[PDB]
RNA sequence: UGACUGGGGCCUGUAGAGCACUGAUAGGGCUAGGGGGCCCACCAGCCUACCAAACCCUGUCAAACUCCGAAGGGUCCCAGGUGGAGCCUGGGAGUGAGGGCGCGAGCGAUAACGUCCGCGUCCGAGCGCGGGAACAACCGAGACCGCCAGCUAAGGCCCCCAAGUCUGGGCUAAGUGGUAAAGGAUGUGGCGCCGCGAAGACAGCCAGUCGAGUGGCGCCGCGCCGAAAAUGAUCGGGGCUUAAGCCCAGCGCCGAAGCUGCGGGUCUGG
RNA sequence: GGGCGGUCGCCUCCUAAAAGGUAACGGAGGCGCCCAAAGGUCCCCUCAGGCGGGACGGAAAUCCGCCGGAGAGCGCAAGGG
RNA sequence: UCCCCCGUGCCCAUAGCGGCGUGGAACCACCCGUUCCCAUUCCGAACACGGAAGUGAAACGCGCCAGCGCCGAUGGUACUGGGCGGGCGACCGCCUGGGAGAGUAGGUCGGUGCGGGGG
């Protein structure tokens, strides 16, 4: 799917969701880029309905860069069962993305067809995307 | 390319950004001060500048400093900058990342490739008197294998890079 | 390294530091905190003989002397790679004890 | 000597950030093994848009990671601080079922008038009073008694209902206002900075006539669809459209058991 | 809700909101011993790793040479040191 | 007061690694020996003792260098005591006191006490 192969824990607490992003902010890969509006968890079967559709779109077409891992582990209780008893099991992976994470990135492609493929991708994402080209993101000295 | 900038007293730096004039700041080894350009003009400049090309800032002195822009700020949401850092030049042999022209089309464009433009822009050591421009590399038998990397380039004498060779600059990868 | 430095087992006050050279046998009372000496004395180096052993006894009872007349009476002993053994300054009058 | 406050000195590992340690991580370089083509079994040899250690570059993640690190908090000293403050010894208790709200976390499904702790508040015991249509804990305010006096607070000044159909500039035509999302649309109003227009086709019939404003994304204000549940409906009601709605100024009034004015009581202190 | 299940004392880390303290049938491990030298003191000595080089010798049997401030070690969990 | 070297403290890498020059009259070290004191799980390697034929090669002292290492502003943000907002809610904005970390300009091959010997 797209989870870690090895965890020095198997679950974790569930923590807030702060402003901002503190990194990931500038494109640095590709040409074009998709950017975040809305913070939310994003699940592995979606950052992958995401990929796929990208390449669906443009069939041996460029390369996709995938700016984000679903570290996270997703905990949930077995259907109605009472509280407590202690934590759940572990169902599936999902990564923190905060208001301006830059989330995918495709290059070596037709401006036209990186317009296109990136606005499907936000049709498989529970959040407000924005796209974005290559400007002033020149973080050097 | 040319801009107007202005002295700062140290006054409201959210006051000066909502009327439109961006914050930033000049220094060098004698003279660090703070100014304020306006975001209107600055972003015609720097869309076409950047940091390969060089600025002058002409200030209620006459004085057109030459500069370049070390340091941008951004806002991280709604990508909108909030300061600028100028570094004051003369002449002395002083950094700067030179851009890089990729003319050309590798066989790997054709046997399932695509150019990666690893580090399109080259870090190097030359005096203000010398600013040299699109420093560029030829590919064409760059087939999907590896790729070139490092001093493996065009270098005007003058011209001494601060990298390794090792720092990679492009490659041939596959399709999707 | 020789690092050593079971000086640092010094828990008391008055430093007798001992410093044994290939030619020569050297050794100065130290007030520490303060960072200061207060007495001296050494073997050619203070004018002497050229031997060896008996060069340091001389050092010595020349260090005891000086010392009594300045109001100081006990101390604690060094050499850091001492080895405590041959060149001693095996000495009387200091109240330094053995 | 108190709470609280000013000035100093220690102690601390959170918010935030970072990748030096522990682990995780996407891509490229460099490069042990292994797979596999060239091929010989006498074992070597060359290649491979295969899987791939260690290491380096770019980019990031972490309650049980930290090179780093605030605001604050803890404590001690010197001061202000006369308070239904404080400290010491003793007589009398009740309580040991809490609840809502705000902020910081865990559990839960970033569900619950859910549940666990931590910091504060109000109800409890202020279901006494004003505002909120009605309503313990949201806003205003801590009610000894009396008065056909005066000023205010939240909230209000078209009628029900005390006080402005008050003044000046804008927006909205949906009754939006009068409580809903992804996503859709030449609704409007205000900013843009780009095409290219006597190589005078933007719209129309052979391109000549035609003789000018045309398109293109992108910002901001206000609104439109998206919008189906069970006894009779409604924003509290009537009713409101250059407003009695929304935005921005300005002056004035109404409004409590709060604050003044006058008279009285009781308890402390003087 | 009660049962069936699980638990009941003790230590280490997190939850813990930069003093202390702090809950839940919250996340994750250990103890119910051992040492007659594994104790006292005095005098000595310094690691793990890595790359060379060496008969039998693996991929660290023991030998030699450089580099290597601690990542080794400290009877057993984790933390601090 | 001014140089050089030998001891010994305070600062805690701006003192460090690596490069390159120097220094033996005096200090210092290496050096000569293993009878003697005292040594080796085997080795005078190390500790230790008696010496002075030789050398500054090694070690140490003193310089100079910025490749790595180390230090590092100013501005501007993040976050936040206290006060107040907008929204129906995940969350977002103002006012007033405080203010990082990264990154930039730049800084660094030390400073400084006490005592000895030599001109």
């Known amino acids: 799917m797209l989870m870690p192969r090895r965890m020095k824990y198997r679950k974790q607490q569930r923590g807030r969701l702060k402003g901002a992003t503190k990194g990931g902010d500038y494109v640095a890969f590709g040409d074009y880029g998709l950017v975040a509006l809305e913070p939310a968890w994003i699940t592995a079967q979606q950052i992958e309905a995401a990929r796929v559709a990208m390449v669906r779109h443009f069939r041996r077409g460029g390369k996709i860069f995938i700016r984000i891992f679903p ?7 077995p259907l109605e069962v009472r509280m407590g008893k202690g934590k ?3 169902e599936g992976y999902v990564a923190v993305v905060k208001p301006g994470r830059v989330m995918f990135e495709v290059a070596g492609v037709t401006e036209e067809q990186a317009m296109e493929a990136l606005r499907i991708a936000g049709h ?4 407000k995307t924005k796209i974005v080209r290559r400007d002033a993101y020149d973080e050097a000295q | 390319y040319r801009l107007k900038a202005y002295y700062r007293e140290g006054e409201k730096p959210s006051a000066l950004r909502r009327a439109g004039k961006l914050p930033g700041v000049m220094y060098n080894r004698h003279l660090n001060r703070k100014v304020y350009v306006d975001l209107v003009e600055f972003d015609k400049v720097f869309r076409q500048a ?5 600025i002058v800032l002409e200030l209620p002195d006459g004085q057109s400093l030459p500069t370049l822009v070390r340091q941008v700020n951004l806002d991280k949401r709604r990508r909108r900058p909030e300061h ?3 570094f004051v030049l003369s002449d002395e042999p002083v950094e700067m990342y030179v851009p890089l ?24 050591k030359v005096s203000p008197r010398n600013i040299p421009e699109f420093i560029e590399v030829d590919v064409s038998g760059l087939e999907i294998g590896d790729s070139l990397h490092a001093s493996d380039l065009k270098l005007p004498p003058g011209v001494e890079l601060a990298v390794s060779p090792e720092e990679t600059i492009a490659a041939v990868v596959p399709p999707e | 390294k020789f690092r050593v430095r079971n000086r640092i087992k010094r828990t008391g006050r008055l430093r007798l530091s001992v410093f ?5 046998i050297y050794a100065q009372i130290i007030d520490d905190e303060k960072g200061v000496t207060l007495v001296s004395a050494s073997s050619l180096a203070l004018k002497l003989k050229g031997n060896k052993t008996e060069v340091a006894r001389q050092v010595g009872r020349a260090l005891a002397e000086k010392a009594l007349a300045l109001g100081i009476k006990q101390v604690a002993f060094d050499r850091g790679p001492y080895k405590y053994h ?3 300054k095996a000495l009387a009058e200091g109240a330094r004890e053995g």
């Open chain 3, 20 to 24: 044994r050279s290939l030619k020569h």
């Open chain 1, 88 to 90: 759940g099991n572990v």
């Open chain 1, 124 to 127: 498989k994402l529970p959040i």
């Open chain 2, 101 to 124: 022209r990729f003319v050309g089309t590798p066989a790997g464009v054709r046997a399932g490739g695509v150019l990666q433009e690893i580090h399109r822009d080259i870090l190097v």
């Open chain 1, 71 to 77: 570290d996270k582990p997703y905990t949930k209780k």
């Open chain 2, 84 to 86: 600028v850092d100028f």
């Open chain 2, 50 to 54: 950047s940091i390969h090309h060089v």
């Open chain 3, 86 to 88: 041959g060149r001693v």
